[model samples]
Target: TPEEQRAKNAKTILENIQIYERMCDLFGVSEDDKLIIENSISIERMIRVVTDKKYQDKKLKNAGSDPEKIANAGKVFCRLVESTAGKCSARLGMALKPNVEAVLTDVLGNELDRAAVLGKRMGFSAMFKSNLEEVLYQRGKNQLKKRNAAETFTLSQGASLEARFRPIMEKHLGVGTVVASIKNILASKKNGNYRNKMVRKPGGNRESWSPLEREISFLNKKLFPGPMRQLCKKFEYLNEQEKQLALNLMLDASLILKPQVTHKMIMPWSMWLAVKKYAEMNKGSPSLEDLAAYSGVRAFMAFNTACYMSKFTIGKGIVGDAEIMENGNDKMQTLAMACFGLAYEDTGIVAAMISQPMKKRYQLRVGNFNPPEKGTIKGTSAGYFHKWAEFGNRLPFNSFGTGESKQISNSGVFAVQRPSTTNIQRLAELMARNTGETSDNFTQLVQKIREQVGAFADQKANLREFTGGYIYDITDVTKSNPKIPQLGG
Candidate 1:
């Protein structure tokens, strides 16, 4: 029975090879390339058995005897290896057949069987070594080229944000007024004070007042009261609101201007309340200038762009530090938030700019927590607001226009979102150990972030305007029409 089962299992391996061969032929891949893929699959399976007990147990259970289920499994693995091999070939300059075969033969001793079917001994001989690491090394080279072309290092803070906002202001208030306002705004007294106080280092100046002042002074010239006094004198007919609107318009315009922010990322829904309040005040037909003064909208747009660009540059490898060596999806989301906050002066975009990343970094430090799965409400970027609210119970009511409510210091935003309650208790344990505070202190740490963001809100309600229609103009679901270059690698 053992011998018969081994024979059947060996036959199943051959069946897997058939599917591999068909995929290769269907894609017009040469026979030599097909063998390279088959060898890599065996090598991957060998590595998995040693490293992944789950995979090993499944392998032991199946023993490769069931053609029906194994065939389905075969399709998944076949496609995976074939795709990986093609990527490897493309990255390593193709003609990989000889080099890969040479590597395999050298590492796996030459006891190679010549049978058309890969026998057990031949597969076993290929164990104890793997080229998977080498494969990643080669793939990393491809991303390096993409990162270089993105020019991540050159977008100077004021210039980039200014360039984006210029056209938006130009559209609503005319180019002459927009140009004049920026020049006047820059020449003012506070601009000098802001610059002198600016933190100029690459990543160390996140807490400084200069970054937020850059947005505030530039968006609402009213902040520099002296400059606005002169501006009003020159324009004669321009009211204080329009002057501020002209500045705010620039910030809003920049959100959709050149090097446009991708709408594929998450958006803060709190912005809509500002729009609603502004519209109601204006009898439901608010002009562009009517929506000025709410700095949060500008922050929301800039943060979205920052998050999008952060993902792009980090995903491609143009931006990172010691904490961002791996570029997986979860790592990209968390690190992109860090990059948005720490890498540039966009920290003033929202109070959450600092807090969001703080939560994510803690999530990571606690042990790699699992994010939401696909097809669920929290899966897509659109559902990010749901998670943001669900996990941020301590935020100020005015922050999202929910209402004027007192802070809840002991709220368990972290525990509520945990997929397993055990993970919550474990996280609390680790927090207690690291900080020397009781587990109760965990909520306070999060509450502290909300308290910090709220403290800066002044006597005014913590709110910003949201242009409901403008968001749709920037966001779309098509992912820009997928296209593979026709030229051969």
Candidate 2:
């Protein structure tokens, strides 16, 4: 009955492979270069290994002939191969055949007898047929799209203008202006220095006043007084309700204006807000009043002028640092330039200037500690430590002594000592002693790393004295004929 079932399962796998091969041949797909073909073949071979009756019988001999244990062993074997096949297919595709073969040889040995029973069952090729197809198709489509997008996307002037100016108006003018205005208003209110102060007895060498003082006196008498008188006249012309509304408008505008004191920073947003408010006031209709608002075209022009001037200021700052570095006139010129370069690099200003459309790539939020759902390797402590120790001992520089001898030739000794078998055993003991827990594979990877680092440190301390400083004279140690011209000589 088991033989019949095995044959039936093998027939299903062969049928699926037949269909897959037909499809590949029809599409002129060579198994040599195709990943799906290679993975399917690997999965088929592993299935054959696991489902073989001889393999199951052999495993059952050691597992006390228990049906559950036999089934579990077969399942684990299949799962391990399937998981590895999926990862290899995803990354290297058909090109990973040699690597897969090497791993199989290392893990399973030359004889496939132990894997035969599980191998006779339906393999990953049958179990995950749809999943494999979807992955292959999606990968192919993504590769094509990436190639096309790379080829077609060009740095056009229209694209450049949109990328550069759109963010400035939308982000800087619209959002940044509002936020900056609010901050300035709040800061001024908190500081309690909202009003301007006049300097009547200005400090200067002249008996009368400095040029700045003279200019301030002229403003106080002529322009400031006139503006005050005009404001009073405007208030007299309006009703109390209108006057209140006018006062509120003036205060709001003043708050907004204070933060953008420089003309270069003022004009664009002022015009934008002016146009928007005018349209809103006129019930969204283009009335003569709205048209009259546009009469302040000079103010709008001033805003654009201010922005251009600010750009010049920023450009100057960038160029000045470069020039300072070039001349080498200042003692700290390089350091100053380096600091500026660091600031620029941190701010991503150079990147922004070069590529306006560049955005941070989106990444999936794989939370901190989530692990795979199934397919894990289980092994005894001896097996784990042996593997680790073998890996460590194989390192080229692991046997190099510590201390002065180690210091003499530090160039090729960059490699650090890895965990040995003793170190791993000591760690297991320490973990068991400290946590009062001992299991096959429950120890965290970080805990193991910590123990290994400690072991290396201890080893370093012990070997520090002998690693370097000792030199032996071997001039006459080896006897060789001068006439023969020995290899050592």
Candidate 3:
């Protein structure tokens, strides 16, 4: 039986290779490249066995002899490696060959918990343009304070109540008081597990003259002054109605009026990504109301993006230090001036900007990630160049959007059709999958995003206005067909 099992095991590799070839054809992969892909599959499987006990147990249960299931599992591994290989080839200059395993190990720093089909923690970072981790590690930190700092950061006297509650509002908060200091008076009402150790909380919700003055200020601004003032002060825990008032206040004060953007804001890439995709799907001529609506949507999407990016980036890298780094915040500013398609290089910029330079100072020789490229990009740029070959100039930007027009329905004021097209839309589906929000759940998520956008627009504190070059570029893109190289990338 063992001898027979060995023979079948030998037989399955060839059968699995056939499946790989067929998939290769559909995905436009070269048959010649199949040889290297096979080797990498073996390398990846070796790593998978060592890291994923569930994966190994499945094989052990069958004594590694089931031709049917093993071959199918091979199929999954092949597709995973193949696609990641293509992205790495195009974006990070990684080679697509038998030796790619060496490069994978090299770029990923031989980290045990790397993100791959084998990696326990998978995210966008795992689908690397190689070693974006190092860039992120060396990225410089700015003093730009986040409006809604996570609950872990403690706050003291004269702090921003409305500001501190946005992100933490999503957490459970009916627990009993954990502390008994002046700041701890509102401890039961706070969002995070740990109390903020910082004094004199900063940003738009600055210290007010008196209790009622703060209340009137928030009332005029349509913010729940009573809750922010009382709960954040020496008061007891708040009610649900009081706590839910300012959940929509995401961006800092500086972002409220900003008309332009860079890769410098809190979740900057996500905001740009939403607006750019909205423009591509529609006529690019969204009303000011539309921009405001999209900003609201961006708020949540940015939140999702931040979670994934952080989970991948920090979890993969070493411990970052204190002494606040990078002054980042959020907004959906004027389109032309700010929204410049999804910056594929946002990771690089963030890595270069927000990362610590001590342990790892990335000396980029050529690529976009703040440094230089040592070797020639002979093969790494394959996927995008291949993308050019396939789509011509009409390569839609944004990692996700329902480039689906021609829908016939009772589409509401914020009409969003389904998605199964475009790379960004594809990217969104995968992210939603990882977040454990299935297709139906995702639909509700999108709807909620739009609803929040619509609701947040009427806020008195939030401002929206049009600006130059931004609207023009957007209108021009929608007006003409999707061409013009300078704009999309």
lDDT per residue (tens digit) for residues 1-489 in model 1: 654554554344333334334434433444333333223343334323333334546676876667776544433221222223223222111223233334334434444232223332232222111112111122244324222111221121212112223322211221222333344444443445222335322232344455234433233332112222223233323444554444443333322222121111111111222233334455857332322221223333433322322211111231223554432444334433322222222232221322232222223321121111111111113222111110111112222232244322234556464433234564565465455443333234335334533443452342322312111212332223222112234
Q: Tens digit of lDDT per residue, candidate 2, span 1-489?
A: 644544553343334434334323333343321223223333444434444444556666799768886555534221101124222112212312333334344334545343332232222222222122221222234324222121111100011111112212221121122222223333445677354222223243233543224322322222112222233234334444444443333333232211111111111111222333334555857322222221222222222222221110001112222233221111111111111111111123222221111111121111111112322221111110010000010111233332433223123345876543234454565466556342322123224334544554565544322132111111211222111111232
Stretches of model 2 off by over 4 angstroms after superposition: 1-55, 58-393, 399-452, 455-489
Task: Record all residue pairs in model 1 with backbone atoms less than 3 Å apart, i.e. clashing.
Answer: 164-254
Off by over 4 Å in 1: 1-158, 161-165, 169-318, 321-382, 387-489
lDDT of 2: 0.27
Question: Which portions of model 3 miss their true places by more than 4 Å?
Answer: 1-28, 31-76, 80-103, 112-236, 239-462, 466-469, 472-489
Return the lDDT, model 1, position 13: 33
TM-score of 1: 0.21
TM-score of each: 0.21, 0.14, 0.21
lDDT of 3 by residue, 160-254 (tens): 21222311211111011011012232343464633343322135555535322333333233212222222223122324333232222212211
Cα lDDT, model 2, residue 432: 64
Give the clash count for each candidate.
1, 21, 32
Candidate lDDT scores, in order, read 0.30, 0.27, 0.27
Model 1 RMSD in angstroms: 29.6
